[PDB]
Tab-separated table of C-alpha atoms in Angstrom:
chain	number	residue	atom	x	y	z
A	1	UNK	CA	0.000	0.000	0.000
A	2	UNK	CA	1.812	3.392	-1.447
A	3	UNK	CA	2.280	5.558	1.454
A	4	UNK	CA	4.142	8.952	0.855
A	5	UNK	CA	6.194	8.813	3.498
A	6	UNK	CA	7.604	12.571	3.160
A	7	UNK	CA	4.675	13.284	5.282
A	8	UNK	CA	5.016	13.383	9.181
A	9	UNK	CA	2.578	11.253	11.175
A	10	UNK	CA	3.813	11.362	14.735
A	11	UNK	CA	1.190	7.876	15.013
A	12	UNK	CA	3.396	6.153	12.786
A	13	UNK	CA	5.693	5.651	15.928
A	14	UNK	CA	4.413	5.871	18.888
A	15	UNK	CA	3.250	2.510	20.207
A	16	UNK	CA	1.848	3.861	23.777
A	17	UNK	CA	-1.247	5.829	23.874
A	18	UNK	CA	-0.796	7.363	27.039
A	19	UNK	CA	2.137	9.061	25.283
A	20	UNK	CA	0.202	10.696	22.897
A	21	UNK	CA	-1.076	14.578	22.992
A	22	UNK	CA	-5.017	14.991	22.851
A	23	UNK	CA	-6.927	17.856	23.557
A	24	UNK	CA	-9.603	17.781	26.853
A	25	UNK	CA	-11.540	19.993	28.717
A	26	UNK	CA	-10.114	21.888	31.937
A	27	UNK	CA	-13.625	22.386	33.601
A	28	UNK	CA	-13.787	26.308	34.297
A	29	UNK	CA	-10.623	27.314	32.324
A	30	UNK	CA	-11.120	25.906	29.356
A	31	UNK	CA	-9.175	23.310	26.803
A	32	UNK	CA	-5.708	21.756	27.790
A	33	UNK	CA	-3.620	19.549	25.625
A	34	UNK	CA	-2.393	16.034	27.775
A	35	UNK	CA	-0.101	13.339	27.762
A	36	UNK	CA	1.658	11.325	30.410
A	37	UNK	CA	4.566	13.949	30.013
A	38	UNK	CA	1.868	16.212	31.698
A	39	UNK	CA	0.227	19.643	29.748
A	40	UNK	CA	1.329	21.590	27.115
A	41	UNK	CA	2.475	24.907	29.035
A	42	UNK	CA	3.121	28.483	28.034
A	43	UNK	CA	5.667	30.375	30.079
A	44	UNK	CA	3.753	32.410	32.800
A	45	UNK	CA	5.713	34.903	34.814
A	46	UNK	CA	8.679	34.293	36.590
A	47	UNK	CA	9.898	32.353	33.080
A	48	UNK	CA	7.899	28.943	34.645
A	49	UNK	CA	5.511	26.863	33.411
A	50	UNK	CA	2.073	27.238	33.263
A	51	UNK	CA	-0.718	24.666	32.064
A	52	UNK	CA	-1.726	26.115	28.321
A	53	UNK	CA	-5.353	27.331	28.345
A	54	UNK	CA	-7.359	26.986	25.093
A	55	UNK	CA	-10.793	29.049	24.545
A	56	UNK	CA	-12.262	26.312	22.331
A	57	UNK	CA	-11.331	22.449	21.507
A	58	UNK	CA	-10.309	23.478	18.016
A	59	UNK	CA	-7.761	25.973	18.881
A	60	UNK	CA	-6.633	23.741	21.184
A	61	UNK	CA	-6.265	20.614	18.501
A	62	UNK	CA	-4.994	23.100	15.835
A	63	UNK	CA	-2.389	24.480	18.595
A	64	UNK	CA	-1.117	20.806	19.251
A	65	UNK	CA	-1.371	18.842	15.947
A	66	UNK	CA	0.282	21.961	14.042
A	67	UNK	CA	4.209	21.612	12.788
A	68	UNK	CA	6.787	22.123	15.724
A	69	UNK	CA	7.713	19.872	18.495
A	70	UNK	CA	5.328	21.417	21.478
A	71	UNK	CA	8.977	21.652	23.899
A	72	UNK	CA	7.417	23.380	26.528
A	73	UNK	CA	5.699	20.965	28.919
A	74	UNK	CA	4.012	21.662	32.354
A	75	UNK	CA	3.636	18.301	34.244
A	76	UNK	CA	2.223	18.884	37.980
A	77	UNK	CA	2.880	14.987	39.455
A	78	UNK	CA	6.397	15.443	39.276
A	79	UNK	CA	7.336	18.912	39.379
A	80	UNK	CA	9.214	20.263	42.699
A	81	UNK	CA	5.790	22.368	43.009
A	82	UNK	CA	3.372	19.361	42.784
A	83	UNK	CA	-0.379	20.414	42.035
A	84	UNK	CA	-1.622	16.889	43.500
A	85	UNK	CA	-5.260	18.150	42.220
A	86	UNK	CA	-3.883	19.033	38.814
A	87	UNK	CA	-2.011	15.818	38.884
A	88	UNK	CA	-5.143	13.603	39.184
A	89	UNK	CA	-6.977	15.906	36.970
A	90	UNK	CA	-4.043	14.693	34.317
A	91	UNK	CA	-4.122	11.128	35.049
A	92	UNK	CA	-8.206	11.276	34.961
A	93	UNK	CA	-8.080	12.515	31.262
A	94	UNK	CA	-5.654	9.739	30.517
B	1	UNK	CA	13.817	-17.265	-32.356
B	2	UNK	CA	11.612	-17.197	-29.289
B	3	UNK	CA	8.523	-18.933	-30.053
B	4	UNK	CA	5.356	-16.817	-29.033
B	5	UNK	CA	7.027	-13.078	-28.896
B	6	UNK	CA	3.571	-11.542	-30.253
B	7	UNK	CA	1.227	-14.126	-29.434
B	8	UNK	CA	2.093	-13.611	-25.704
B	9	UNK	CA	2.728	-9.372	-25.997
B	10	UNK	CA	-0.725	-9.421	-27.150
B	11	UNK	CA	-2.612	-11.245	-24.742
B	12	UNK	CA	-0.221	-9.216	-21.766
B	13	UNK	CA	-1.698	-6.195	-23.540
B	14	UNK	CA	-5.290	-7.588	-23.833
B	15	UNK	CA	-4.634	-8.625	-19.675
B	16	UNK	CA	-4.070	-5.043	-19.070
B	17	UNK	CA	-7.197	-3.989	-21.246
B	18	UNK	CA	-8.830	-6.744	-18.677
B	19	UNK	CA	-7.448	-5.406	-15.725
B	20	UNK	CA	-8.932	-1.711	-16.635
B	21	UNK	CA	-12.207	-3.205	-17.881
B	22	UNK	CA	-12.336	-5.129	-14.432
B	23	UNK	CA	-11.914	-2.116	-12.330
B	24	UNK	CA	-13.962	0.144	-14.352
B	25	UNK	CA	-17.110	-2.539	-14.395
B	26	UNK	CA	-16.649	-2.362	-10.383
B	27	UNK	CA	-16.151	1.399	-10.680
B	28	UNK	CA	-19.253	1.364	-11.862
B	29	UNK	CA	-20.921	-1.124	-9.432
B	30	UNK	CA	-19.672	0.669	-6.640
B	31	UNK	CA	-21.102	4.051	-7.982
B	32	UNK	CA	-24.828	2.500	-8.442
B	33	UNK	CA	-24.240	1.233	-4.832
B	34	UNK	CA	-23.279	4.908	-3.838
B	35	UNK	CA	-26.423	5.705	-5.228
B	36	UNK	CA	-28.576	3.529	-3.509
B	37	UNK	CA	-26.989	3.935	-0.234
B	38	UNK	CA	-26.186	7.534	-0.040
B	39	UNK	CA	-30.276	7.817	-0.602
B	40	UNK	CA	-31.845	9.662	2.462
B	41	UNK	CA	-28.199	10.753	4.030
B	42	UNK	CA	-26.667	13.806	5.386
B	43	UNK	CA	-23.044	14.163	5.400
B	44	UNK	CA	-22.644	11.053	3.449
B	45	UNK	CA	-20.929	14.068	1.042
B	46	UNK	CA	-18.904	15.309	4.264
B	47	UNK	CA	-15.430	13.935	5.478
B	48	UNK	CA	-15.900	11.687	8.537
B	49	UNK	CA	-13.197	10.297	11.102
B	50	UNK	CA	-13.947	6.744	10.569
B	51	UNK	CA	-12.500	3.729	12.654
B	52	UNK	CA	-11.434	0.950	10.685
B	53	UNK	CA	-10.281	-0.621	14.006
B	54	UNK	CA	-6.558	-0.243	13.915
B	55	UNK	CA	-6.381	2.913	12.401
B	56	UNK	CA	-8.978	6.497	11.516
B	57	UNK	CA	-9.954	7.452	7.876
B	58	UNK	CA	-11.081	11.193	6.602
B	59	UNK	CA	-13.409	9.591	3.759
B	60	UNK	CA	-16.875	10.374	2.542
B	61	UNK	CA	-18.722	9.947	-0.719
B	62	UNK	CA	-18.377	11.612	-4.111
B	63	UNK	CA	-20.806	13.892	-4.854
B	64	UNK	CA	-20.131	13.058	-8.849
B	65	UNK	CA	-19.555	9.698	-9.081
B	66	UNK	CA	-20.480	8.264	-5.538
B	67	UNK	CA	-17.695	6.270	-4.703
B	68	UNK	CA	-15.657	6.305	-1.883
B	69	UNK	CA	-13.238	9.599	-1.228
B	70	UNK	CA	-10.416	9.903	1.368
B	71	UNK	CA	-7.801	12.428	2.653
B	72	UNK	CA	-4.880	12.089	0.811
B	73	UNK	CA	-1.482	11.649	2.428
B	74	UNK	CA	0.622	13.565	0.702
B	75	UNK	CA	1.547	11.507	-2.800
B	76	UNK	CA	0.742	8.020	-1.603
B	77	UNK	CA	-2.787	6.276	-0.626
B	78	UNK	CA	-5.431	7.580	1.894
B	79	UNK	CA	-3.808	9.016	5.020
B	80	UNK	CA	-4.413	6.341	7.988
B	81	UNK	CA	-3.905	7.745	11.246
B	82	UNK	CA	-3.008	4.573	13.070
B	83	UNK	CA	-3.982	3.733	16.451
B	84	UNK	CA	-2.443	2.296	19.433
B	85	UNK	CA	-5.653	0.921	20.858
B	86	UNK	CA	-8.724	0.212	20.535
B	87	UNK	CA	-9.574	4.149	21.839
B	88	UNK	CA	-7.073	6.214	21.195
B	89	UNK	CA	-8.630	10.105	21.512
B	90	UNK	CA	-5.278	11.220	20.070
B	91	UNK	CA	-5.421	9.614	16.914
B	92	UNK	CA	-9.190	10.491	16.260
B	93	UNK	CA	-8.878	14.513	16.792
B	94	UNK	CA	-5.708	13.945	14.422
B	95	UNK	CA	-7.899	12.839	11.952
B	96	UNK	CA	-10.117	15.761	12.647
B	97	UNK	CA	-7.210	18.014	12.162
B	98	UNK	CA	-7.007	16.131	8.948
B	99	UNK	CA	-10.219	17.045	7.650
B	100	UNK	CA	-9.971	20.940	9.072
B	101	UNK	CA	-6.667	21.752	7.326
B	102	UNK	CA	-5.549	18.962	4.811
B	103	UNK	CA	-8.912	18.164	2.695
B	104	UNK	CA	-7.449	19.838	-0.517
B	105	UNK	CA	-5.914	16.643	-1.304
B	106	UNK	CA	-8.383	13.393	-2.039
B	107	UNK	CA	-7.938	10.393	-3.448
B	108	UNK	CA	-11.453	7.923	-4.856
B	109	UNK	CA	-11.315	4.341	-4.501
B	110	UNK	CA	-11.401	2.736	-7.980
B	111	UNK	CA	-10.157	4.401	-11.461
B	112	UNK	CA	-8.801	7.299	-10.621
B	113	UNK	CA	-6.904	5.449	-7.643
B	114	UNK	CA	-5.356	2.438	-10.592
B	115	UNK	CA	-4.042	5.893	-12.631
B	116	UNK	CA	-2.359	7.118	-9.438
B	117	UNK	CA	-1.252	4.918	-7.492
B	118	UNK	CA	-0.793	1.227	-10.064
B	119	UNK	CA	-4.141	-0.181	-7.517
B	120	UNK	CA	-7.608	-0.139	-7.176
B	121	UNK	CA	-7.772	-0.729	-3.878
B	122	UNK	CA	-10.625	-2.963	-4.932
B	123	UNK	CA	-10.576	-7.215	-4.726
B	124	UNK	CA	-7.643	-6.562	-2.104
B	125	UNK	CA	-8.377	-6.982	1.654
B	126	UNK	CA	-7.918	-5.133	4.084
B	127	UNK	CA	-7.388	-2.317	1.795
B	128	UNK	CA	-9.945	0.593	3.054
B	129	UNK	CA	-12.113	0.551	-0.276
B	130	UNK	CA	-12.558	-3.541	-0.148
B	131	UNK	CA	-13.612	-3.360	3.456
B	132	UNK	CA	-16.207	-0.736	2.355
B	133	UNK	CA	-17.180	-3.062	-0.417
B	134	UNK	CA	-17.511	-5.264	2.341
């Protein structure tokens, strides 16, 4: 089966689903994008991390299925300031 | 002197003339059968993230001919997001993302896939377009 493989498919290789990025909703705030490697973050002051907030689900799919690597990561189970309700949130969505 | 030089170039020619008469009779098959199902459906014209089990398809129906359409993956076959399990949320809203921003390039089950790709995609489980068939 022909399959143009110029074209990047981050599915092709990723065999764990918990590993993959999809977009859910942060109940009062909005649309977050999750994984196991925690939320897709935006740097909020003091050049941390901050949990990106989307206003609708297709910003926040368009944000995280775009072109770029998403580097910056916000992950609250294993950060030195654990957010232990943010953390179960995470693992809930999973 | 080999013995059956034309004998045999013509019936490999006439095969090929088989092969194209083959697809295009099922071509058409498949078109009455878009016809007769797409009757009393909405969106069966829209794309559609459609499980195939181990991976998502953008597809719908022709609005010309009827057949079977999908999101093209760059110069290959249809794009299949693949799956890691049976639910896999990430793979789905990829295929969403699919159909939001990548819809200018389709490719139809049938003819116009044999002239682009060498295939039908027809008579050739589990390709997507015999499972439909199916």
């Amino acid at each position: 089966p022909a399959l143009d493989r110029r074209v990047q498919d981050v599915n092709d290789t990723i065999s764990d689903v918990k590993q993959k990025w999809r977009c859910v909703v942060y109940p009062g705030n909005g649309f977050v994008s999750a994984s196991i490697f925690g939320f897709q973050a935006e740097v909020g002051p003091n050049n941390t991390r901050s949990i990106r907030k989307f206003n609708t689900m297709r910003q926040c799919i368009d944000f995280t299925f775009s072109d770029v690597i998403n580097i910056d990561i916000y992950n609250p189970c294993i950060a030195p300031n654990i957010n232990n309700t943010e953390c179960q949130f995470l693992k809930s969505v999973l | 002197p080999v013995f059956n030089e034309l004998t045999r170039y013509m019936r490999i020619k006439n095969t090929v003339n088989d092969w194209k008469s083959l697809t295009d009779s099922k071509t058409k098959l498949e078109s009455d059968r878009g016809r007769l199902l797409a009757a009393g459906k909405d969106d069966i014209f829209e794309f559609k993230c459609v499980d195939f089990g181990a991976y998502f398809i953008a597809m719908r129906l022709d609005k010309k001919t009827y057949l079977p359409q999908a999101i093209r993956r760059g110069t290959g076959d249809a794009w299949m997001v693949k799956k890691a399990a049976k639910v896999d949320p990430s793979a789905q809203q990829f295929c969403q993302y699919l159909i939001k921003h990548k819809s200018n390039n389709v490719i139809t089950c049938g003819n116009e896939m044999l002239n682009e790709l060498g295939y039908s995609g027809y008579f050739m489980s589990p390709h997507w377009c015999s499972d439909l068939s199916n």
